[PDB]
Design a binder for these strands. Sequence first.
RNA 1: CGUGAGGGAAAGGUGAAAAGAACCCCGGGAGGGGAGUGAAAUAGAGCCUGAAACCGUGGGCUUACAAGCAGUCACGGCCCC
RNA 2: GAAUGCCGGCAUGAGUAACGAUAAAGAGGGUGAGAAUCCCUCUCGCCGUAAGCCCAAGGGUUCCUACGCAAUGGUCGUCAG
RNA 3: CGAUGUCGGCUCGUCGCAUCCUGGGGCUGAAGAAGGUCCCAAGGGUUGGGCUGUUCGCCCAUUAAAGCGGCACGCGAGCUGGGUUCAGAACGUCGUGAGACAGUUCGGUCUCUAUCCGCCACGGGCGCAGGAGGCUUGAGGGGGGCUCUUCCUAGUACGAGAGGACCGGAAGGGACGCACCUCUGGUUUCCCAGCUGUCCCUCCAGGGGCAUAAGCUGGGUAGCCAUGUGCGGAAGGGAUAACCGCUGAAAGCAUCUAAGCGGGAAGCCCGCCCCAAGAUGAGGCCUCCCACGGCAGCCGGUAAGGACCCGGGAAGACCACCCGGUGGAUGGGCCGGGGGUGUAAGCGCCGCGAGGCGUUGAGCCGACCGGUCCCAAUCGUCCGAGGUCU
Lengths: 118, 204, 16, 59, 122, 131
Amino acid sequence: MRHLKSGRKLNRHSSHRLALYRNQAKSLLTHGRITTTVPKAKELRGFVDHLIHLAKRGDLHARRLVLRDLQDVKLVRKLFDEIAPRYRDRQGGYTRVLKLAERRRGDGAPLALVELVE
Amino acid sequence: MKGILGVKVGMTRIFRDDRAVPVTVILAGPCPVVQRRTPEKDGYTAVQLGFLPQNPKRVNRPLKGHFAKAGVEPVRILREIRDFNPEGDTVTVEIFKPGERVDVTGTSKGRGFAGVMKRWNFAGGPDSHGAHKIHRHPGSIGNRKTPGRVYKGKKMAGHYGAERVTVMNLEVVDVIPEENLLLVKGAVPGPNGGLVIVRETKKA
Amino acid sequence: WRIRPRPPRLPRPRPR
Amino acid sequence: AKHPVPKKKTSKARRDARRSHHALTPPTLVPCPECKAMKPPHTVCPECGYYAGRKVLEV
Amino acid sequence: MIQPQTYLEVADNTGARKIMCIRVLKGSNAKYATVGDVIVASVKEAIPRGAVKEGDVVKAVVVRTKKEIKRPDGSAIRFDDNAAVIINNQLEPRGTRVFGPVARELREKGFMKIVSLAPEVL
Amino acid sequence: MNRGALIKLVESRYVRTDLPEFRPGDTVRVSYKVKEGNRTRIQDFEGIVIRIRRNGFNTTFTVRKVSYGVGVERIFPLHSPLIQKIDIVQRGRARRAKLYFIRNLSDREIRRKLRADRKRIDQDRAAERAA
RNA sequence: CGUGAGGGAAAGGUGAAAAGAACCCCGGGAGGGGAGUGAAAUAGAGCCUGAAACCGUGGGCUUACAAGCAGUCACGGCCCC
RNA sequence: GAAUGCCGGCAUGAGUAACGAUAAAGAGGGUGAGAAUCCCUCUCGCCGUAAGCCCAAGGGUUCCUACGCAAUGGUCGUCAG
RNA sequence: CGAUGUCGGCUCGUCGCAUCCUGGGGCUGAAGAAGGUCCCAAGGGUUGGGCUGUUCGCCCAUUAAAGCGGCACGCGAGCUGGGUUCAGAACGUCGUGAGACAGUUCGGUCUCUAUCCGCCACGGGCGCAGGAGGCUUGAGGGGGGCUCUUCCUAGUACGAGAGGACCGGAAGGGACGCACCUCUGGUUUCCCAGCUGUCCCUCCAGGGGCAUAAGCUGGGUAGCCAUGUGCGGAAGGGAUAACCGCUGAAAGCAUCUAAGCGGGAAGCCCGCCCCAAGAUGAGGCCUCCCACGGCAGCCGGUAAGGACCCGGGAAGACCACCCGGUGGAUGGGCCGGGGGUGUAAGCGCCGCGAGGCGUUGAGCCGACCGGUCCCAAUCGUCCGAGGUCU
Ligand SMILES: [Mg+2]
Ligand SMILES: [Mg+2]
Ligand SMILES: [Mg+2]
Ligand SMILES: [Mg+2]
Ligand SMILES: [Mg+2]
Ligand SMILES: [Mg+2]
Ligand SMILES: [Mg+2]
Ligand SMILES: [Mg+2]
Ligand SMILES: [Mg+2]
Ligand SMILES: [Mg+2]
Ligand SMILES: [Mg+2]
Ligand SMILES: [Mg+2]
Ligand SMILES: [Mg+2]
Ligand SMILES: [Mg+2]
Ligand SMILES: [Mg+2]
Ligand SMILES: [Mg+2]
Ligand SMILES: [Mg+2]
Ligand SMILES: [Mg+2]
Ligand SMILES: [Mg+2]
Ligand SMILES: [Mg+2]
Ligand SMILES: [Mg+2]
Ligand SMILES: [Mg+2]
Ligand SMILES: [Mg+2]
Ligand SMILES: [Mg+2]
Ligand SMILES: [Mg+2]
Ligand SMILES: [Mg+2]
Ligand SMILES: [Mg+2]
Ligand SMILES: [Mg+2]
Ligand SMILES: [Mg+2]
Ligand SMILES: [Mg+2]
Ligand SMILES: [Mg+2]
Ligand SMILES: [Mg+2]
Ligand SMILES: [Mg+2]
Ligand SMILES: [Mg+2]
Ligand SMILES: [Mg+2]
Ligand SMILES: [Mg+2]
Ligand SMILES: [Mg+2]
Ligand SMILES: [Mg+2]
Ligand SMILES: [Mg+2]
Ligand SMILES: [Mg+2]
Ligand SMILES: [Mg+2]
Ligand SMILES: [Mg+2]
Ligand SMILES: [Mg+2]
Ligand SMILES: [Mg+2]
Ligand SMILES: [Mg+2]
Ligand SMILES: [Mg+2]
Ligand SMILES: [Mg+2]
Ligand SMILES: [Mg+2]
Ligand SMILES: [Mg+2]
Ligand SMILES: [Mg+2]
Ligand SMILES: [Mg+2]
Ligand SMILES: [Mg+2]
Ligand SMILES: [Mg+2]
Ligand SMILES: [Mg+2]
Ligand SMILES: [Mg+2]
Ligand SMILES: [Mg+2]
Ligand SMILES: [Mg+2]
Ligand SMILES: [Mg+2]
Ligand SMILES: [Mg+2]
Ligand SMILES: [Mg+2]
Ligand SMILES: [Mg+2]
Ligand SMILES: [Mg+2]
Ligand SMILES: [Mg+2]
Ligand SMILES: [Mg+2]
Ligand SMILES: [Mg+2]
Ligand SMILES: [Mg+2]
Ligand SMILES: [Mg+2]
Ligand SMILES: [Mg+2]
Ligand SMILES: [Mg+2]
Ligand SMILES: [Mg+2]
Ligand SMILES: [Mg+2]
Ligand SMILES: [Mg+2]
Ligand SMILES: [Mg+2]
Ligand SMILES: [Mg+2]
Ligand SMILES: [Mg+2]
Ligand SMILES: [Mg+2]
Ligand SMILES: [Mg+2]
Ligand SMILES: [Mg+2]
Ligand SMILES: [Mg+2]
Ligand SMILES: [Mg+2]
Ligand SMILES: [Mg+2]
Ligand SMILES: [Mg+2]
Ligand SMILES: [Mg+2]
Ligand SMILES: [Mg+2]
Ligand SMILES: [Mg+2]
Ligand SMILES: [Mg+2]
Ligand SMILES: [Mg+2]
Ligand SMILES: [Mg+2]
Ligand SMILES: [Mg+2]
Ligand SMILES: [Mg+2]
Ligand SMILES: [Mg+2]
Ligand SMILES: [Mg+2]
Ligand SMILES: [Mg+2]
Ligand SMILES: [Mg+2]
Ligand SMILES: [Mg+2]
Ligand SMILES: [Mg+2]
Ligand SMILES: [Mg+2]
Ligand SMILES: [Mg+2]
Ligand SMILES: [Mg+2]
Ligand SMILES: [Mg+2]
Ligand SMILES: [Mg+2]
Ligand SMILES: [Mg+2]
Ligand SMILES: [Mg+2]
Ligand SMILES: [Mg+2]
Ligand SMILES: [Mg+2]
Ligand SMILES: [Mg+2]
Ligand SMILES: [Mg+2]
Ligand SMILES: [Mg+2]
Ligand SMILES: [Mg+2]
Ligand SMILES: [Mg+2]
Ligand SMILES: [Mg+2]
Ligand SMILES: [Mg+2]
Ligand SMILES: [Mg+2]
Ligand SMILES: [Mg+2]
Ligand SMILES: [Mg+2]
Ligand SMILES: [Mg+2]
Ligand SMILES: [Mg+2]
Ligand SMILES: [Mg+2]
Ligand SMILES: [Mg+2]
Ligand SMILES: [Mg+2]
Ligand SMILES: [Mg+2]
Ligand SMILES: [Mg+2]
Ligand SMILES: [Mg+2]
Ligand SMILES: [Mg+2]
Ligand SMILES: [Mg+2]
Ligand SMILES: [Mg+2]
Ligand SMILES: [Mg+2]
Ligand SMILES: [Mg+2]
Ligand SMILES: [Mg+2]
Ligand SMILES: [Mg+2]
Ligand SMILES: [Mg+2]
Ligand SMILES: [Mg+2]
Ligand SMILES: [Mg+2]
Ligand SMILES: [Mg+2]
Ligand SMILES: [Mg+2]
Ligand SMILES: [Mg+2]
Ligand SMILES: [Mg+2]
Ligand SMILES: [Mg+2]
Ligand SMILES: [Mg+2]
Ligand SMILES: [Mg+2]
Ligand SMILES: [Mg+2]
Ligand SMILES: [Mg+2]
Ligand SMILES: [Mg+2]
Ligand SMILES: [Mg+2]
Ligand SMILES: [Mg+2]
Ligand SMILES: [Mg+2]
Ligand SMILES: [Mg+2]
Ligand SMILES: [Mg+2]
Ligand SMILES: [Mg+2]
Ligand SMILES: [Mg+2]
Ligand SMILES: [Mg+2]
Ligand SMILES: [Mg+2]
Ligand SMILES: [Mg+2]
Ligand SMILES: [Mg+2]
Ligand SMILES: [Mg+2]
Ligand SMILES: [Mg+2]
Ligand SMILES: [Mg+2]
Ligand SMILES: [Mg+2]
Ligand SMILES: [Mg+2]
Ligand SMILES: [Mg+2]
Ligand SMILES: [Mg+2]
Ligand SMILES: [Mg+2]
Ligand SMILES: [Mg+2]
Ligand SMILES: [Mg+2]
Ligand SMILES: [Mg+2]
Ligand SMILES: [Mg+2]
Ligand SMILES: [Mg+2]
Ligand SMILES: [Mg+2]
Ligand SMILES: [Mg+2]
Ligand SMILES: [Mg+2]
Ligand SMILES: [Mg+2]
Ligand SMILES: [Mg+2]
Ligand SMILES: [Mg+2]
Ligand SMILES: [Mg+2]
Ligand SMILES: [Mg+2]
Ligand SMILES: [Mg+2]
Ligand SMILES: [Mg+2]
Ligand SMILES: [Mg+2]
Ligand SMILES: [Mg+2]
Ligand SMILES: [Mg+2]
Ligand SMILES: [Mg+2]
Ligand SMILES: [Mg+2]
Ligand SMILES: [Mg+2]
Ligand SMILES: [Mg+2]
Ligand SMILES: [Mg+2]
Ligand SMILES: [Mg+2]
Ligand SMILES: [Mg+2]
Ligand SMILES: [Mg+2]
Ligand SMILES: [Mg+2]
Ligand SMILES: [Mg+2]
Ligand SMILES: [Mg+2]
Ligand SMILES: [Mg+2]
Ligand SMILES: [Mg+2]
Ligand SMILES: [Mg+2]
Ligand SMILES: [Mg+2]
Ligand SMILES: [Mg+2]
Ligand SMILES: [Mg+2]
Ligand SMILES: [Mg+2]
Ligand SMILES: [Mg+2]
Ligand SMILES: [Mg+2]
Ligand SMILES: [Mg+2]
Ligand SMILES: [Mg+2]
Ligand SMILES: [Mg+2]
Ligand SMILES: [Mg+2]
Ligand SMILES: [Mg+2]
Ligand SMILES: [Mg+2]
Ligand SMILES: [Mg+2]
Ligand SMILES: [Mg+2]
Ligand SMILES: [Mg+2]
Ligand SMILES: [Mg+2]
Ligand SMILES: [Mg+2]
Ligand SMILES: [Mg+2]
Ligand SMILES: [Mg+2]
Ligand SMILES: [Mg+2]
Ligand SMILES: [Mg+2]
Ligand SMILES: [Mg+2]
Ligand SMILES: [Mg+2]
Ligand SMILES: [Mg+2]
Ligand SMILES: [Mg+2]
Ligand SMILES: [Mg+2]
Ligand SMILES: [Mg+2]
Ligand SMILES: [Mg+2]
Ligand SMILES: [Mg+2]
Ligand SMILES: [Mg+2]
Ligand SMILES: [Mg+2]
Ligand SMILES: [Mg+2]
Ligand SMILES: [Mg+2]
Ligand SMILES: [Mg+2]
Ligand SMILES: [Mg+2]
Ligand SMILES: [Mg+2]
Ligand SMILES: [Mg+2]
Ligand SMILES: [Mg+2]
Ligand SMILES: [Mg+2]
Ligand SMILES: [Mg+2]
Ligand SMILES: [Mg+2]
Ligand SMILES: [Mg+2]
Ligand SMILES: [Mg+2]
Ligand SMILES: [Mg+2]
Ligand SMILES: [Mg+2]
Ligand SMILES: [Mg+2]
Ligand SMILES: [Mg+2]
Ligand SMILES: [Mg+2]
Ligand SMILES: [Mg+2]
Ligand SMILES: [Mg+2]
Ligand SMILES: [Mg+2]
Ligand SMILES: [Mg+2]
Ligand SMILES: [Mg+2]
Ligand SMILES: [Mg+2]
Ligand SMILES: [Mg+2]
Ligand SMILES: [Mg+2]
Ligand SMILES: [Mg+2]
Ligand SMILES: [Mg+2]
Ligand SMILES: [Mg+2]
Ligand SMILES: [Mg+2]
Ligand SMILES: [Mg+2]
Ligand SMILES: [Mg+2]
Ligand SMILES: [Mg+2]
Ligand SMILES: [Mg+2]
Ligand SMILES: [Mg+2]
Ligand SMILES: [Zn+2]
């Protein structure tokens, strides 16, 4: 059935779904705010919050870890140098998902924004 | 004929006389008597019970006035045990003791729109030898011109589970009065955290 | 059970 | 299969009977506490950009 | 879990080696036999000039199964093959020895002479 | 409420701590209690622990042996009151966590694949010096 | 349409006169609403007349315990002249 | 008024099946009355004895620009054979 | 005949009873056991194989038993396509010939979309004279209905012996059913590890993609599961069938019956489990709101309540159901525990090296049991009684 299952499938197979999350982490950590569909947005929260948390740690293990999903050493530096300090005292919840009022025209998909918290 | 409201909590096995007895644990007690059904006013004999304290905020006005007339603080569930009139005005696990024998009623795990093989233990079709897109399909559903129709109650696919299920003659293994725990060797309907009812057995 | 085998009245359908 | 086809042309009455469940439900809307404009609930106000009492985006 | 067509090893000096179960002697329509159940079997591979020969039809009781067996004490046990022991109608072994451990469940089922002759009752 | 707490609570009375810790690969000897006809015996089952599945109180470990030409696997609950005592008889080094693969190996292959975990042997003998 | 020989349609009508609708307004356009023309603009170019099936908006009577080739005969109720 | 009639018009099925390979998408920026679909960027994926390239037949302006979006494009379109 | 697709198989059953078994009986050339035979009884059950297209039939091994029939020889808009109707080819036979044969042989297009009834599930609407939130009665339906072996009685009754009970009381199974995941056993699409070829990041080390819609391999939580586990078939009351009686005339005797009363089946009615007041005959009880403004009707604003919207959920196709919505632990994050994997990178040291050792049960780490307001359930809006008549 589906009883007590975690995480959407989002109409992608196993690698595509992982890529989907990685490229959005790349995008979200790059711009600090992105518009997407509301399902995707809610899914983005944790995948990113793990990365920010591992940034907060800072040891070499954590960076080499995050690198596997983000691949970009300049980007990861933004994560450890500029982003992570903002959260040393924040006990999780480094992302925000707000829903937007208007819809896509070509398929009425409902939209949301995902940004990083102050 | 005594009963009690309770919640299914989870299964385990213990060891009793070098034998392994698989039990399920039910947080039964305590259940305050909220109303009593008497022949004069209602027709039959039963007790309305209560479970799980509730936010007096969450409990609406007509409900509130009901609870109050009995002297009870707001509680999440009202259910009746039939042909039961306990002496006190509050029911605990201690109305059962080990060696007894119970009937347990819960809501089964809902299997949603279930197929005909899951729901009715059918046997579908072959998975080779030319069998054509019918591997999970029921088969024939009727006859021909006579009767030219389908028997009422025909076993077909549809929703299955999330229905009331009562299991009979379950050994009371142990009662933990302090923590309001009731042990019962066997399988009780429903999921953990599901509301259940524990009455004395109908069997003998 | 009909002892005398019963011959088909129709051909197996073929495209026309 | 054997190509199930319809038997009788459905009545005017009957197809409209089928469609008694087809009425759209009008959009459910609330006034924005900042700019008073009728917006969907739990959505950032699309006409002044406010949500939760603060400014969130540009409109 | 022995059932018709199951091959089994014979664990005695009856001269058989493989038997092919063809019925579980357990009531009307039993699905599988386990340790302690009789079966009717066909001898499929024997050794020359023995108690039994190829193609015989002999009863036999199953002494160890490659499916595990649960026990009331929570334990379980499974062996590395499926083995049986040939018998006469009076459930007595038709050979003189037994080869390899047998489940203690044979005692409770009354196959004493097999348990006693076994090298290890487990 | 806490359903998990309540369950761990029932499991209490039956929990043991007298048992020496062991890992897959460790050859071991279980002294187990059996009933035969009437009497009660302590029968010893001795072999390499090949799996250890945990569920807290419901944890259970499987023990592979070879008996008079037949392989015997044997499952024991780690908190059974029929288990008198367990004596480690040899520590081994498992690069794996479930050793099902040794079912298919000869003697000289298993000895080659489960060498003595000298690290834990050294600690074993370093314990037991409770002077 | 057919390789080809060869097969082989559909499709007429503003008004007397273009006087074919400047200008303004909504709209991206289409389209429409005023203004104007005209005897007439449901003659506005998708244009004489503009039937029927078919779709629709509004109104009157009626319909959610009821069995039907759908009508018909009677009676009662409501609405209209 | 019926010829499985002929011609055309319009219904039903029905907002239903389907929207043409399961190689795959995500975000930012721009244009614009309008953007999942056009352009730019970065990211991800597919082909690589091809899903790249050059000839021949055949097709016959489909080439390149500019300005367009009624229809054509299975949606959208500011884009386009 | 402007088409009613035709054997057998599979699947799903449903009914009849002229009953194969199980139950209850009479008669027996019925000692006991076991049979024969007739009557009552359709509740439930009625196995797995070898051969043949086969239905059927024989055979093997069991069994309580391996019933016979109807439903378009039930069931091709459910499946098969072995038999049999097409065209190809051959054998025997027939025919000068083309060809042909209830004679044999090898091969041979089975059609994605369900309008109406019916059926399985799920809602929306209205009604149930005031409007509401709960909790219920159960009219009437449905489901279930099986049976074996061993022991005790007792090697007793019976019998020359072999053989072997009625009744009564124990325990253990087979098949089916509902439920469940503690255990056993699966899966567990990215939860951990290992490995090859190639391209890449960043040279080393470390990593990433692709080799499937997991590249391969070893493992695996929650969940969904059976091979695993729990429990069910009853008990018991009532009325009965065949059959057996008590009392008893008509008919001084006899008669189970004509008056009356018993006993007597797995069968019928209750009883068990489940659905159910659309049971329009629309039930019952507990609690809540209550005489609001204007010309048995209308128009508003409200009451108690409800709904929309949102966070969600072992609930679920949508709908519904159930929980929560800041006065809050609902999802996400985070933290602790569990659990899986089984000792990460980094450094130090050892070896020429592939590696090895230690740090280190380390590192990573879905869902499981919990905590935590860090993030998101902001803010609100709309419907909603004034109660007809004797
Ligand atoms: Mg499923
Ligand atoms: Mg699925
Ligand atoms: Mg969850
Ligand atoms: Mg995932
Ligand atoms: Mg899909
Ligand atoms: Mg898709
Ligand atoms: Mg897609
Ligand atoms: Mg889709
Ligand atoms: Mg892949
Ligand atoms: Mg965007
Ligand atoms: Mg997580
Ligand atoms: Mg560093
Ligand atoms: Mg990671
Ligand atoms: Mg579109
Ligand atoms: Mg669009
Ligand atoms: Mg919206
Ligand atoms: Mg659980
Ligand atoms: Mg105890
Ligand atoms: Mg309940
Ligand atoms: Mg449920
Ligand atoms: Mg479900
Ligand atoms: Mg199920
Ligand atoms: Mg089922
Ligand atoms: Mg099944
Ligand atoms: Mg089957
Ligand atoms: Mg199957
Ligand atoms: Mg089958
Ligand atoms: Mg086919
Ligand atoms: Mg298939
Ligand atoms: Mg099909
Ligand atoms: Mg079918
Ligand atoms: Mg009929
Ligand atoms: Mg349901
Ligand atoms: Mg049920
Ligand atoms: Mg019992
Ligand atoms: Mg045709
Ligand atoms: Mg089909
Ligand atoms: Mg087909
Ligand atoms: Mg079709
Ligand atoms: Mg017709
Ligand atoms: Mg019609
Ligand atoms: Mg009409
Ligand atoms: Mg109409
Ligand atoms: Mg209709
Ligand atoms: Mg519809
Ligand atoms: Mg509407
Ligand atoms: Mg052997
Ligand atoms: Mg041997
Ligand atoms: Mg031979
Ligand atoms: Mg031979
Ligand atoms: Mg011995
Ligand atoms: Mg010895
Ligand atoms: Mg737990
Ligand atoms: Mg587990
Ligand atoms: Mg060994
Ligand atoms: Mg080694
Ligand atoms: Mg070591
Ligand atoms: Mg052409
Ligand atoms: Mg031609
Ligand atoms: Mg031409
Ligand atoms: Mg022609
Ligand atoms: Mg004209
Ligand atoms: Mg003219
Ligand atoms: Mg004129
Ligand atoms: Mg203008
Ligand atoms: Mg303008
Ligand atoms: Mg303008
Ligand atoms: Mg334009
Ligand atoms: Mg104009
Ligand atoms: Mg206009
Ligand atoms: Mg105009
Ligand atoms: Mg004028
Ligand atoms: Mg005009
Ligand atoms: Mg006119
Ligand atoms: Mg005119
Ligand atoms: Mg016209
Ligand atoms: Mg004229
Ligand atoms: Mg006209
Ligand atoms: Mg016209
Ligand atoms: Mg007209
Ligand atoms: Mg109208
Ligand atoms: Mg009207
Ligand atoms: Mg009428
Ligand atoms: Mg009526
Ligand atoms: Mg009426
Ligand atoms: Mg009517
Ligand atoms: Mg009639
Ligand atoms: Mg009629
Ligand atoms: Mg008519
Ligand atoms: Mg009259
Ligand atoms: Mg005529
Ligand atoms: Mg026609
Ligand atoms: Mg026709
Ligand atoms: Mg005509
Ligand atoms: Mg025509
Ligand atoms: Mg025509
Ligand atoms: Mg025309
Ligand atoms: Mg036409
Ligand atoms: Mg026509
Ligand atoms: Mg038309
Ligand atoms: Mg019409
Ligand atoms: Mg149409
Ligand atoms: Mg139709
Ligand atoms: Mg239509
Ligand atoms: Mg539509
Ligand atoms: Mg639809
Ligand atoms: Mg349809
Ligand atoms: Mg289609
Ligand atoms: Mg198509
Ligand atoms: Mg579709
Ligand atoms: Mg297609
Ligand atoms: Mg392909
Ligand atoms: Mg496609
Ligand atoms: Mg494919
Ligand atoms: Mg992106
Ligand atoms: Mg893009
Ligand atoms: Mg433009
Ligand atoms: Mg557009
Ligand atoms: Mg895009
Ligand atoms: Mg874009
Ligand atoms: Mg577009
Ligand atoms: Mg696209
Ligand atoms: Mg572009
Ligand atoms: Mg980027
Ligand atoms: Mg190449
Ligand atoms: Mg291609
Ligand atoms: Mg050319
Ligand atoms: Mg062309
Ligand atoms: Mg266009
Ligand atoms: Mg345009
Ligand atoms: Mg144009
Ligand atoms: Mg087009
Ligand atoms: Mg278009
Ligand atoms: Mg196209
Ligand atoms: Mg071009
Ligand atoms: Mg015919
Ligand atoms: Mg016809
Ligand atoms: Mg026809
Ligand atoms: Mg026809
Ligand atoms: Mg036949
Ligand atoms: Mg009879
Ligand atoms: Mg009998
Ligand atoms: Mg009988
Ligand atoms: Mg005799
Ligand atoms: Mg007798
Ligand atoms: Mg008799
Ligand atoms: Mg029957
Ligand atoms: Mg058979
Ligand atoms: Mg064979
Ligand atoms: Mg056969
Ligand atoms: Mg046959
Ligand atoms: Mg035959
Ligand atoms: Mg018999
Ligand atoms: Mg027999
Ligand atoms: Mg029949
Ligand atoms: Mg039948
Ligand atoms: Mg007939
Ligand atoms: Mg027929
Ligand atoms: Mg037939
Ligand atoms: Mg049919
Ligand atoms: Mg048929
Ligand atoms: Mg067919
Ligand atoms: Mg057929
Ligand atoms: Mg048919
Ligand atoms: Mg048909
Ligand atoms: Mg054929
Ligand atoms: Mg074929
Ligand atoms: Mg043939
Ligand atoms: Mg001749
Ligand atoms: Mg001649
Ligand atoms: Mg002649
Ligand atoms: Mg022939
Ligand atoms: Mg013939
Ligand atoms: Mg033939
Ligand atoms: Mg062939
Ligand atoms: Mg098809
Ligand atoms: Mg329909
Ligand atoms: Mg109808
Ligand atoms: Mg019909
Ligand atoms: Mg309803
Ligand atoms: Mg009333
Ligand atoms: Mg009311
Ligand atoms: Mg209510
Ligand atoms: Mg409600
Ligand atoms: Mg009830
Ligand atoms: Mg009833
Ligand atoms: Mg009824
Ligand atoms: Mg009944
Ligand atoms: Mg029964
Ligand atoms: Mg005796
Ligand atoms: Mg006696
Ligand atoms: Mg004797
Ligand atoms: Mg007895
Ligand atoms: Mg059954
Ligand atoms: Mg089931
Ligand atoms: Mg379940
Ligand atoms: Mg379950
Ligand atoms: Mg579990
Ligand atoms: Mg397991
Ligand atoms: Mg498991
Ligand atoms: Mg990961
Ligand atoms: Mg190599
Ligand atoms: Mg690689
Ligand atoms: Mg490297
Ligand atoms: Mg390394
Ligand atoms: Mg690449
Ligand atoms: Mg590639
Ligand atoms: Mg790929
Ligand atoms: Mg492969
Ligand atoms: Mg991989
Ligand atoms: Mg795997
Ligand atoms: Mg596994
Ligand atoms: Mg799992
Ligand atoms: Mg599990
Ligand atoms: Mg099972
Ligand atoms: Mg079972
Ligand atoms: Mg049972
Ligand atoms: Mg009875
Ligand atoms: Mg007498
Ligand atoms: Mg007398
Ligand atoms: Mg008498
Ligand atoms: Mg009488
Ligand atoms: Mg009587
Ligand atoms: Mg008597
Ligand atoms: Mg009686
Ligand atoms: Mg019974
Ligand atoms: Mg109920
Ligand atoms: Mg009601
Ligand atoms: Mg009710
Ligand atoms: Mg009635
Ligand atoms: Mg009425
Ligand atoms: Mg009434
Ligand atoms: Mg009433
Ligand atoms: Mg009521
Ligand atoms: Mg009543
Ligand atoms: Mg739902
Ligand atoms: Mg939902
Ligand atoms: Mg919806
Ligand atoms: Mg909704
Ligand atoms: Mg509620
Ligand atoms: Mg609520
Ligand atoms: Mg609120
Ligand atoms: Mg609320
Ligand atoms: Mg929370
Ligand atoms: Mg809570
Ligand atoms: Mg939490
Ligand atoms: Mg979630
Ligand atoms: Mg732990
Ligand atoms: Mg651990
Ligand atoms: Mg190491
Ligand atoms: Mg290391
Ligand atoms: Mg290293
Ligand atoms: Mg060195
Ligand atoms: Mg090593
Ligand atoms: Mg660990
Ligand atoms: Mg982690
Ligand atoms: Mg952890
Ligand atoms: Mg707190
Ligand atoms: Mg507001
Ligand atoms: Zn605003």
